[PDB]
Design a protein around this ligand. Structure first.
Ligand SMILES: *[C@@H]1O[C@H](CO)[C@@H](O[C@@H]2O[C@H](CO)[C@@H](O[C@@H]3O[C@H](CO)[C@@H](O)[C@H](O)[C@@H]3O)[C@H](O)[C@H]2NC(C)=O)[C@H](O)[C@H]1NC(C)=O
Ligand SMILES: *[C@@H]1O[C@H](CO)[C@@H](O[C@@H]2O[C@H](CO)[C@@H](O[C@@H]3O[C@H](CO)[C@@H](O)[C@H](O)[C@@H]3O)[C@H](O)[C@H]2NC(C)=O)[C@H](O)[C@H]1NC(C)=O
Ligand SMILES: *[C@@H]1O[C@H](CO)[C@@H](O[C@@H]2O[C@H](CO)[C@@H](O[C@@H]3O[C@H](CO)[C@@H](O)[C@H](O)[C@@H]3O)[C@H](O)[C@H]2NC(C)=O)[C@H](O)[C@H]1NC(C)=O
Ligand SMILES: *[C@@H]1O[C@H](CO)[C@@H](O[C@@H]2O[C@H](CO)[C@@H](O[C@@H]3O[C@H](CO)[C@@H](O)[C@H](O)[C@@H]3O)[C@H](O)[C@H]2NC(C)=O)[C@H](O)[C@H]1NC(C)=O
Ligand SMILES: *[C@@H]1O[C@H](CO)[C@@H](O[C@@H]2O[C@H](CO)[C@@H](O[C@@H]3O[C@H](CO)[C@@H](O)[C@H](O)[C@@H]3O)[C@H](O)[C@H]2NC(C)=O)[C@H](O)[C@H]1NC(C)=O
Ligand SMILES: *[C@@H]1O[C@H](CO)[C@@H](O)[C@H](O)[C@H]1NC(C)=O
Ligand SMILES: *[C@@H]1O[C@H](CO)[C@@H](O)[C@H](O)[C@H]1NC(C)=O
Ligand SMILES: *[C@@H]1O[C@H](CO)[C@@H](O)[C@H](O)[C@H]1NC(C)=O
Ligand SMILES: *[C@@H]1O[C@H](CO)[C@@H](O)[C@H](O)[C@H]1NC(C)=O
Ligand SMILES: *[C@@H]1O[C@H](CO)[C@@H](O)[C@H](O)[C@H]1NC(C)=O
Ligand SMILES: *[C@@H]1O[C@H](CO)[C@@H](O)[C@H](O)[C@H]1NC(C)=O
Ligand SMILES: [Cl-]
Ligand SMILES: [Cl-]
Ligand SMILES: [Cl-]
Ligand SMILES: [Cl-]
Ligand SMILES: [Cl-]
Lengths: 331, 340, 331, 331, 332
């Protein structure tokens, strides 16, 4: 019965409008993040979705209790009757606190007056990407934490636990990406309305080439290899050799144009676009070679036979040399 | 009156009224003492969907929680009180949440699909109808001859093992409706209930765990990918029976079967999430590519030699007619035995 | 002024927590449905969307009024101050009450104490479908109405108007389906927590073949006729006759694989698949016929000429016979 | 200070449950709509989206004020404390009142006690369409406005401004459609629960052929012209002439099947399907013509040469005649 | 302590229904926008999405305080207890105030009685587009700010900071577009219910040709170059030369029809559409040339040989001339 009256004494005459230490020193909010998952990474909408346990820790002397030598875990609905920091994710596209079975919210009071406030949030944050080196690229995605209305005079942010404040980054299971590094940053960003406290979480994503080797690289190598079958077919076979030319020239064009439609409409040329343009030149030259052989074999059969003979070794050699130059330059 | 008229609505009203007078929702039952024991019960209405692309699944269920709140015990009435669901907003309830939940919701037509039943001893029966999209990370190395394990992780959001304790009410028979699941592409092979106490920085937390073992039905894949592969490979063999004078015809069969094979593999890969490994089906489709590419190389070779060596060329076409179907049957036999 | 003091005295001391006749006989709720539309029927998500006027009728003696000889239509917000049945659709996926300009909700009180409670709901209900006979199939879709918390001891459901309780089923405008029949059912489903009242609405949907004749059947018949043009072309024409073979054999494969992707991933074989597999055998045999003629015309020109001669009559005859057997068996 | 106390005493003892003139003559609500836009028209989901300023006007004597000779514009939140008509859109699929920065809501009181109530609503309304004449079709789309719970005994609806009640129909910017006409209708629809007031807004949409000429009509003409190139190619060219025949026949079937997938699964034949079927017969006959010429040129070279000579004039002539008959019949 | 009580007297007997200076001169609301991002630009739904910090400044004498010589930042929930302008975006399709961890809302009181009210809004606004010059086109997209219920007699709007009221336009990272200019406008739009205050923010977007050069222009140039290979192939090669004709003619048709499906169903013809119609004519004429050569080479082999050797120079020349005329006309 003592503990019942105590909680009621705390909130008696409590004004939510006023932050703790209202006219005095700034309230120091300690942030802690446990990353549950990186649900998705989109190049098309140049963003990523993250689910986390967002924990905030500050003192409110108005909530201090003398009698009880225990930490009080109160039903989450009490958060609607308390002052809480106006923390927001500056680079947020859409966010939400999970609400089944209850609001995924936690309030834990300490006799000191300190509050532990937990929220389970799913956030889709913006991540502008440079796809020049795609698919052999690294992306830096961040989560920008800030106060919406309170300046550095009223509110101060800090990572509670220092470099060990954010957890669960190593248990992230992204199939196409691998978290290579993550960094915590504390700043005070100056604006027209004053200086604001800022926390910053950043991770560096490294793309896994596997999918691209199987989807784009192997189909391009095979189309180029299929273009070389023509040099072993009799030059009398005009339809067969032109059919091989047309087929491999168009299939390359569609491999390049298709891949471009799977990504956002960027105006620059990607690493994979350089490879495919190379492959186009090699399959277009095989067809020009037949056109040239077809144009000369009547008057110069020996020369025509020779051009097909040389094409059989020059083309595979030059393509191996192109792959060697390309893959060494990018790695 | 030690026993009161159950039909006296005025006595029930004033009884329920004194129960909630001075009741603090902030405080859990037995606030400073032993933990409150919540008994969980799930009746699975359906497994609405299973997505490989977003590596998740969706289930609809009747989620029931059971606990005793002595503050809600009543002496007069010899009946269990079914109160209008809106009373749940005036009572303390466990902060139960699904740890691996992506999106969830309680159904709200015609009213919130929730139920409160009070018992004279103070026990509360609390029901909710939830739809949950939960994460299910999948290993598609053996796809489409694979099995997946999908779970539902139940936990307390703010209360530690010192304040709340979870248990499956009914033991192994706590979760029902699993046998009534109608999934067209999957079959529930087994399900397991688990009770734990997961340790974290903020303390030990009670955890209940529901698990399924989903087995994929090969039927769709046989008709969509396997039979079209077998037919394109059979198509590539028609070339060996066509006169080697027919350069366009035989190269057209080669090109057609070689490209169709490439598109069967690349298409299937786009229907799934961008995984970097090679699936069971990819091994089969790569095999079929090698068989359809060799038939074209065989014509290239025959075309290259039939002027100077017509007998040899005729023989290579003669042998290809038996070697190719034999080796493909042997490949099918090795693949299907290895994977089953 | 009298009618104003009347409504106030009705809700004074009213306990919303308690159902009418709280400790006595069950309250009898009379359900009535006007179907505004069957907005959609999905095979892919095996469900259907329906919009309706859902009306419930029950008597609450606490709401009886003596003076007024009129039925009182009160502003819908009064429903938040009254007890209402906890009616829910057991097989719904998502549902909602329309909210513009106000909640599409209606409360009509009767001097008796009877309440008429109306709601305009859009419901996406589950409808598991058997597509073995697709597209010559009939589907049975239902709407399962139940009490969420009250057992048969507290609530009883009934169709108000009997067989004429559900209206607007005959004015349903589905382009691909036709409502052939609908049935109303009353039950008491037994569960662990007790017996529950259940009302059940069912429809029998009949698919319209029209779309399929134009999209799948006619393209199959034409691709099969196209394959017969080969038998009239000179056997010297190896490319032409193999081109017709390849073209018709692949087009057949894509007609079947495409249709399968438009539907959910079922493991069985549909009615349309038996027709399309038939067409595949007919187009594959036309190509084997050319292969056979191409294989023999040097040594046996007369026989080759004869095989082409017979193919011209046997193939159209056997295909007509296949169509006749298929359609008679399925109708 | 006098105006401050006037508004407070306005709502003193006011019951929102009770409509104005509760036991007497019906309240006359005057509706008036300014259409901001017709955001979209979908054939697939057979509906259209519309954004508008929905204004309602009625007199509530409980809200009359004596002292002030001005019209009072009160903060929109006051609408939650007043009785408002239960107006709803009968053929509505989904609707919403815009909520940024505030609810797009307006309350203007008049000394008389008259209320001007404004709402900015986006509505997706159903529009069942007849696509038999598509894309030379005209569709009639309506907005059905009704009272949800109040009968003609309690509420009466009317268009405030008569034929000039709905504005902004002439400034509608639909790229594929043109508003040809619009009509306002006032009725009293009889139902089981009584007679209800109904306002009806109807507009007649006319489709713009431009897109279809470029997307379907021109590619069909060009594929049919491509089919005629065959008659000028030597009949010795079996592969070339069969390749033109296969190509034109198949691309024609894909033009028809593709267009059908862009629209809802209707079982009937559209105006554009009649044209495309005609085109198919013309491309299929060009191929049969080659089959016939290929079948006879050995024994009858003169006849074969003649059939190709005639095909060069008969086919373009008959196609021009088909276009003339088609376009005249449909316009 | 004293500050707790001063705010409580401020709101005692305060009527939210009544705007500041009710019945007197119209309240002057000073608008300020900090553009966080232009998230997307859609031609299909002819709209654009924008996220911003929307700030409003007005004076409410009812909220003046004497004791405290400080500006009071109150918990955002106090906005529900104050009068606020009924500001709305006239050309808005869907909008929302961000709500994690709290409503991204800010109230800052000044001893004077002025109020600083901030909101972080994501707005999908309509932008009707003229695609006649697509993809070498400029689009003007606007954000129309208005009062929903209050006339110019009760509310007046103004850009707080003049030409420097809207910030962050230069920091916009659009991959396919570049903000070339932006303009602020103040008006008083007259309607049936009276004159209304209107602020207007306008952007001029310039499309980056890069993507289109790689996706549509280069594949067209490559397909017409492919069509020219036919003139170097022996006229005896009927299948080969007809295969090149059919292939290039159909690929050209799909490049044009595909692009049309990526955009909204407009009835006019775009700048690419006329380039792509030109390429079709070049590519169809190469096939007619073979048909003509195939039709005459028996009786006139010399003439046929000549038509192929002229086609080899006339076609590439004429196509360069088409590109010169088209690209000069469209740069004007
Ligand atoms: C991802 O990108 C961001 C932004 O480009 C990187 O953030 C930057 O991180 C460094 C710390 O690693 C910060 O620099 C520090 O500045 C202080 C004060 O000048 C100095 O004393 C330190 O020695 C250090 O240089 C920097 O402020 C910060 N930039 C911003 C604006 O956030 C981030 O590190 C990258 N993360 C990963 C994992 O790649
Ligand atoms: C699906 O996967 C999960 C996780 O891999 C499986 O859960 C595991 O289930 C077993 C019981 O079958 C638990 O092990 C038990 O541990 C106790 C205490 O050490 C021991 O006394 C028992 O003999 C038994 O080994 C295990 O804790 C649990 N793992 C977790 C973390 O949940 C689940 O069984 C799989 N379900 C299906 C149907 O395949
Ligand atoms: C759609 O499918 C449902 C479920 O398969 C059909 O519902 C069934 O309807 C019949 C009435 O037509 C019910 O049977 C009756 O049972 C009573 C009591 O045993 C008996 O006296 C009657 O003679 C009759 O047999 C049956 O209970 C009911 N099943 C369930 C579980 O709902 C429905 O009729 C089908 N509707 C259409 C329109 O095809
Ligand atoms: C769009 O379609 C609707 C429904 O088919 C048309 O509505 C009809 O409009 C006319 C007035 O133009 C109404 O008819 C009138 O009835 C009275 C009483 O019988 C008679 O005195 C008049 O001479 C006239 O015939 C009719 O009630 C109404 N139908 C309904 C049920 O709404 C509408 O006109 C079409 N709109 C456009 C712009 O094409
Ligand atoms: C985007 O398009 C809009 C609308 O077409 C352009 O808005 C127009 O902007 C000018 C100012 O640049 C306004 O004109 C001014 O009118 C006053 C009064 O007549 C005059 O004193 C000034 O000298 C000036 O001419 C005009 O009212 C305004 N139109 C509307 C209705 O908003 C806008 O400038 C374009 N923005 C960009 C960045 O391209
Ligand atoms: C209360 O919580 C704090 C962490 O802030 C810790 O130091 C202490 O051990 C806890 N005390 C009790 C009573 O368990
Ligand atoms: C019903 O209960 C009330 C107590 O609230 C009491 O006044 C009354 O005596 C009881 N029964 C009757 C109808 O006498
Ligand atoms: C009340 O509920 C319990 C189940 O918890 C059961 O034992 C008992 O039979 C019920 N009693 C009544 C009064 O029906
Ligand atoms: C009141 O409603 C009932 C239907 O439940 C009907 O019998 C009666 O006619 C109505 N009475 C009045 C006053 O209109
Ligand atoms: C008040 O509004 C009415 C329109 O209903 C109009 O007749 C009148 O002029 C307005 N009066 C004032 C005081 O402006
Ligand atoms: C209060 O805010 C204003 C900006 O409106 C500024 O001029 C002034 O410096 C601030 N005063 C204090 C007390 O910091
Ligand atoms: Cl959620
Ligand atoms: Cl729902
Ligand atoms: Cl709605
Ligand atoms: Cl909105
Ligand atoms: Cl948000």
């Amino acid at each position: 019965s003592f503990v019942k009256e105590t909680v009621d004494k705390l909130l008696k005459g409590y004004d939510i409008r006023l932050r703790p230490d209202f006219g005095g020193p700034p309230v120091c909010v300690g942030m802690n993040i446990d990353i549950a998952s990186i649900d998705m990474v989109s190049e098309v909408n140049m963003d990523y979705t993250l689910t986390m346990y967002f924990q905030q820790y500050w003192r409110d002397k108005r909530l201090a209790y003398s009698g009880i030598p225990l930490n009080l875990t109160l039903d989450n609905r009490v958060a609607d009757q308390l002052w809480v920091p106006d923390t927001y994710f500056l680079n947020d596209k859409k966010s939400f606190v999970h609400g089944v079975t209850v609001k995924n919210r936690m309030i834990r009071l300490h006799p000191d007056g300190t509050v532990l406030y937990g929220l389970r949030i799913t956030t889709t944050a913006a991540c502008m990407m440079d796809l020049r080196r795609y698919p052999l690229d690294e992306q830096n995605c961040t989560l920008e934490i800030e106060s919406y209305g309170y300046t550095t005079d009223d509110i101060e942010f800090y990572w509670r636990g220092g470099d060990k404040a954010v957890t669960g980054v190593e248990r992230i299971e992204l199939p196409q990406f691998s978290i290579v590094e993550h960094r915590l940053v504390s700043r005070n960003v100056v604006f027209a309305t004053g200086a604001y406290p800022r926390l910053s979480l950043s991770f560096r994503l490294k793309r896994n080439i596997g999918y691209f080797i199987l989807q784009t690289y192997m189909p391009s190598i095979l189309i180029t290899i299929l273009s070389w079958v023509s040099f072993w077919i009799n030059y009398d076979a005009s339809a067969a050799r032109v059919a091989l030319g047309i087929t491999t020239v168009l299939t390359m064009t569609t491999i390049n144009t298709h891949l471009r439609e799977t990504l956002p409409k960027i105006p620059y040329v990607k690493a994979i676009d350089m490879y495919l343009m190379g492959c186009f030149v090699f399959v277009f030259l095989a067809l020009l070679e037949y056109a040239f052989v077809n144009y000369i074999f009547f008057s110069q059969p020996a020369r025509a036979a020779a051009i097909d003979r040389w094409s059989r070794i020059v083309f595979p050699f030059t393509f191996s040399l192109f792959n060697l130059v390309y893959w060494l330059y990018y790695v």
